[PDB]
Amino acid sequence: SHMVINGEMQFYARAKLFYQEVPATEEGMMGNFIELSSPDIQASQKFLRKFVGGPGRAGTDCALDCGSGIGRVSKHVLLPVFNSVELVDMMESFLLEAQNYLQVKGDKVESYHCYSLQEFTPPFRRYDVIWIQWVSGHLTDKDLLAFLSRCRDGLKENGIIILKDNVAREGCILDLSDSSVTRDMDILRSLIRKSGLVVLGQEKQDGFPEQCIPVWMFALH
């Protein structure tokens, strides 16, 4: 780990108290940048398409949505592509609301896993795609390293991990109010490397305002 956190219990407890007050809505998941949900989803669809479907590329039977919240990414990115999707999130309230939010698309959701990711083992060799969006910043370096390694073991043959998150331009940003660390490129790539993953592709998110931290998508295996 680049940064050790002494007090991981207090760190993760504060994130829980934060998300208890987050509305279980698409706007709530977006943190009142609801206007960025559409360009986010449109870019995610195209990036997914690059790495899914075809010889050697990832299959389309099963995906895992990590830090799913109520399932915004499942609803508009994953469920239109995969035969079945599973959600994992630490907030039971978000997972329960996902059943209402997903409407008919929720009929293809096989499981709602209520776990914190640093305490979660993605089922062995089960997934064609594991999607990790806007939650990696909540894991400490040690825990993200470990979680990425376990995600790799959750992949079927030719499967991939897609990581989509804020990447600070320079250095990192520790946010004590929601227990998150926004990493820079060098830190994140180092952790990706040390987990045993290789970058199959990367893409900067377009259509976001300049006053936002950049967002990047990475395809890994």
Partner: peptide, 6 residues
């Protein structure tokens, strides 16, 4: 989600 510059 998205976050403002610091």
């Amino acid at each position: 989600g998205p976050r403002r510059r610091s």
